[PDB]
Structure 1
Amino acid sequence: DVNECISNPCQNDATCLDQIGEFQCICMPGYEGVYCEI
């Protein structure tokens, strides 16, 4: 139950996709971080 990608998990205006029991935060080209922020 419950998901991970509800209100855009990313923190840099990244694209969210589908994954296996996880979230898919697609950061920009040449970025860093897990939730697209660093």
Structure 2
Amino acid sequence: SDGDQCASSPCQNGGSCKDQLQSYICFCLPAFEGRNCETHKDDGSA
């Protein structure tokens, strides 16, 4: 481990938190956005 990234589950939008060395990876729906899933992108456009 390298730093407290996935300690208190920073992933939001009910996403899964996985430690990927140093940083982390949140598993959120394809309609969310943001490093910690703090945005809901539902426009599409292009």
Q: How high is the TM-score relative to the length of structure 1? A: 0.69
Matched, 1:27 2:28: yes
Identity of aligned residues (%): 45
Matched, 1:37 2:38: yes
Equivalent residue, structure 1, for 2:43:
none
* Greater per-residue strand proportion: 2
Q: Which runs of 4+ in 1 moved over 6 A?
A: none
Equivalent residue, structure 2, for 1:10:
11
Query: Structure 1: where are the runs of 5+ without partners?
Result: none
The alignment's C-alpha RMSD in Å is 1.6
Bigger radius of gyration: 2
Using CA pairs under 8 Å that are at least 6 residues apart, name the structure with larger relative contact order, 1 or 2. Answer: 1
Number of residue-to-residue matches in the alignment: 38
Amino acid at match of 1:5: C
Query: Structure 2: where are the runs of 5+ without partners?
Result: 40-46
